[PDB]
Design an enzyme around this catalytic site. Sequence first.
Site, PDB file in Angstrom:
ATOM      1  CG  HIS A   1      -2.059  -1.189   1.000  1.00  0.00           C
ATOM      2  ND1 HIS A   1      -1.963  -2.198   1.766  1.00  0.00           N
ATOM      3  CD2 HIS A   1      -3.072  -0.856   0.239  1.00  0.00           C
ATOM      4  CE1 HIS A   1      -3.261  -2.720   1.341  1.00  0.00           C
ATOM      5  NE2 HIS A   1      -3.902  -2.149   0.427  1.00  0.00           N
TER       6      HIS A   1
ATOM      7  CG  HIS B   1      -1.483  -0.096  -4.474  1.00  0.00           C
ATOM      8  ND1 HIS B   1      -1.852  -0.787  -5.334  1.00  0.00           N
ATOM      9  CD2 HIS B   1      -2.373   0.467  -3.704  1.00  0.00           C
ATOM     10  CE1 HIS B   1      -3.122  -1.004  -5.075  1.00  0.00           C
ATOM     11  NE2 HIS B   1      -3.562   0.281  -4.339  1.00  0.00           N
TER      12      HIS B   1
ATOM     13  CG  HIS C   1      -6.627   4.020  -4.015  1.00  0.00           C
ATOM     14  ND1 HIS C   1      -5.570   4.154  -4.746  1.00  0.00           N
ATOM     15  CD2 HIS C   1      -6.790   2.932  -3.784  1.00  0.00           C
ATOM     16  CE1 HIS C   1      -4.964   2.819  -4.752  1.00  0.00           C
ATOM     17  NE2 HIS C   1      -5.848   2.083  -4.107  1.00  0.00           N
ATOM     18  CG  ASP C   2      -4.772   2.144  -0.678  1.00  0.00           C
ATOM     19  OD1 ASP C   2      -5.880   2.049  -0.072  1.00  0.00           O
ATOM     20  OD2 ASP C   2      -4.489   1.343  -1.572  1.00  0.00           O
TER      21      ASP C   2
ATOM     22  CG  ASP D   1      -7.492  -0.873  -4.938  1.00  0.00           C
ATOM     23  OD1 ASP D   1      -6.479  -0.726  -4.887  1.00  0.00           O
ATOM     24  OD2 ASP D   1      -8.347  -1.195  -4.085  1.00  0.00           O
TER      25      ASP D   1
ATOM     26  CD  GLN E   1      -3.115 -15.145  -4.492  1.00  0.00           C
ATOM     27  OE1 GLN E   1      -3.450 -14.547  -5.621  1.00  0.00           O
ATOM     28  NE2 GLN E   1      -2.980 -14.528  -3.482  1.00  0.00           N
TER      29      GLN E   1
HETATM   30  C1  LIG Z   1      -8.537  -6.330   0.086  1.00  0.00           C
HETATM   31  C2  LIG Z   1      -6.921  -6.685   0.261  1.00  0.00           C
HETATM   32  C3  LIG Z   1      -6.256  -5.352   0.146  1.00  0.00           C
HETATM   33  C4  LIG Z   1      -4.890  -5.556  -0.427  1.00  0.00           C
HETATM   34  C5  LIG Z   1      -5.420  -6.046  -1.845  1.00  0.00           C
HETATM   35  N1  LIG Z   1      -6.397  -7.306  -1.064  1.00  0.00           N
HETATM   36  C6  LIG Z   1      -6.573  -8.270  -1.875  1.00  0.00           C
HETATM   37  O1  LIG Z   1      -7.308  -9.059  -1.401  1.00  0.00           O
HETATM   38  C7  LIG Z   1      -5.867  -8.674  -2.999  1.00  0.00           C
HETATM   39  C8  LIG Z   1      -5.641  -7.828  -3.888  1.00  0.00           C
HETATM   40  N2  LIG Z   1      -4.952  -8.589  -4.955  1.00  0.00           N
HETATM   41  N3  LIG Z   1      -4.625  -9.632  -4.688  1.00  0.00           N
HETATM   42  C9  LIG Z   1      -3.908 -10.646  -5.618  1.00  0.00           C
HETATM   43  C10 LIG Z   1      -5.166  -9.858  -3.204  1.00  0.00           C
HETATM   44  C11 LIG Z   1      -5.328 -11.182  -2.668  1.00  0.00           C
HETATM   45  O2  LIG Z   1      -4.298 -11.768  -2.705  1.00  0.00           O
HETATM   46  N4  LIG Z   1      -6.290 -11.440  -2.037  1.00  0.00           N
HETATM   47  C12 LIG Z   1      -6.590 -12.643  -1.000  1.00  0.00           C
HETATM   48  C13 LIG Z   1      -7.918 -12.967  -0.705  1.00  0.00           C
HETATM   49  C14 LIG Z   1      -8.038 -14.079   0.120  1.00  0.00           C
HETATM   50  N5  LIG Z   1      -7.006 -14.954   0.268  1.00  0.00           N
HETATM   51  C15 LIG Z   1      -7.166 -16.025   1.159  1.00  0.00           C
HETATM   52  C16 LIG Z   1      -5.557 -16.437   0.954  1.00  0.00           C
HETATM   53  C17 LIG Z   1      -5.019 -17.473   1.568  1.00  0.00           C
HETATM   54  C18 LIG Z   1      -3.749 -17.590   1.713  1.00  0.00           C
HETATM   55  C19 LIG Z   1      -3.203 -18.765   2.511  1.00  0.00           C
HETATM   56  C20 LIG Z   1      -4.016 -19.778   3.205  1.00  0.00           C
HETATM   57  C21 LIG Z   1      -5.287 -19.422   3.297  1.00  0.00           C
HETATM   58  C22 LIG Z   1      -5.959 -18.709   2.300  1.00  0.00           C
HETATM   59  N6  LIG Z   1      -4.790 -15.577   0.252  1.00  0.00           N
HETATM   60  C23 LIG Z   1      -5.780 -14.686  -0.040  1.00  0.00           C
HETATM   61  C24 LIG Z   1      -5.596 -13.545  -0.939  1.00  0.00           C
HETATM   62 MG   LIG Z   2      -7.219   0.728  -0.080  1.00  0.00          MG
HETATM   63 ZN   LIG Z   3      -5.259   0.202  -3.134  1.00  0.00          ZN
END
Ligand SMILES: C[C@@H]1CCCN1C(=O)c1cnn(C)c1C(=O)Nc1ccn2cc(-c3ccccc3)nc2c1
Ligand SMILES: [Mg+2]
Ligand SMILES: [Zn+2]
Length: 313
Positions: A68, A72, A106-107, A217, A269
């Site tokens: 952030h 970004h 935005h951040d 975003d 993912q």
């Molecule tokens: C809202 C926030 C703010 C920053 C961006 N954001 C995002 O969500 C975001 C924005 N771009 N990207 C690529 C993601 C992201 O990777 N999101 C996620 C969402 C759910 N997950 C569950 C698990 C998981 C891992 C290990 C074990 C178990 C589960 N990993 C995730 C990753």
């Molecule tokens: Mg934000």
């Molecule tokens: Zn953002």
Amino acid sequence: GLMQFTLPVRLCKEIELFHFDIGPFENMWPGIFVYMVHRSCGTSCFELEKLCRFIMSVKKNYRRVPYHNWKHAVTVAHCMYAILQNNHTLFTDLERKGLLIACLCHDLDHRGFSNSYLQKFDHPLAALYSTSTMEQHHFSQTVSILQLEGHNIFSTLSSSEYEQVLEIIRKAIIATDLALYFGNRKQLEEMYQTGSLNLNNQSHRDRVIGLMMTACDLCSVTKLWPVTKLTANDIYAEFWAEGDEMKKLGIQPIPMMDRDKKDEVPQGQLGFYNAVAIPCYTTLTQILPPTEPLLKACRDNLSQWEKVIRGEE
Ligand SMILES: C[C@@H]1CCCN1C(=O)c1cnn(C)c1C(=O)Nc1ccn2cc(-c3ccccc3)nc2c1
Ligand SMILES: [Mg+2]
Ligand SMILES: [Zn+2]
Ligand SMILES: [Cl-]
């Protein structure tokens, strides 16, 4: 006034594409952003002296966090630049002005933690703004920087145009609260399907601009696989630091934030691409056909995460 920004030929060409990466040279990002404002909006819409001073005050007010951060901000503005340029006639002179600035800001002053963590810590910001906590702060910081002397890039707008642009920016920044994205996309899905979507209805424009903000975003998922993969490291570096802080408060964090469950990242993912990213770019492509390359790029990256799980990488 007769002072263009130019970029080297490779950037001049690639910057027009949705999957452009802004590169590791921080000192070029301000020029890249002014380039985009000039080509997206006109060389006239801002006084260079004021724009350049707003940009450097915004940069200064992003922190040295893994994700952030200032990179970004400029990445998200570029995605918005690609959407606006590919949907030339659909947007007002004011929307193009406000949305590039909204994306850059935005951040603002993000500390690397979620709204949830502010509330469980009991951070003062969580008393001041009970929902979309960080997003109300980001807008507040935007307005504070616009009010530094020599920083009002909107000085030449009329009083009503001025209130219109600050209202576009406020809604755009609040829309980056991913808790609000799910309901916003459902409503747009329903309106597109029942044929009630009307871009002359202000509350319909508002929802569409909100989906554009979510799309810009999340745009790490629309880059070449190596950009996507290396951005994910930065995202997890914040998630896992927040998990550590959750454990310090005596709270077992969600697996997303637990560096102990690092093993299960690939499956997490898939969940995210299926729950959030794919539906987001699908509805955005339905509403704005020329943004299809984002959906196509997102699908390619989903397919790359599937290959990681199958042990092929
Ligand atoms: C809202 C926030 C703010 C920053 C961006 N954001 C995002 O969500 C975001 C924005 N771009 N990207 C690529 C993601 C992201 O990777 N999101 C996620 C969402 C759910 N997950 C569950 C698990 C998981 C891992 C290990 C074990 C178990 C589960 N990993 C995730 C990753
Ligand atoms: Mg934000
Ligand atoms: Zn953002
Ligand atoms: Cl153009």
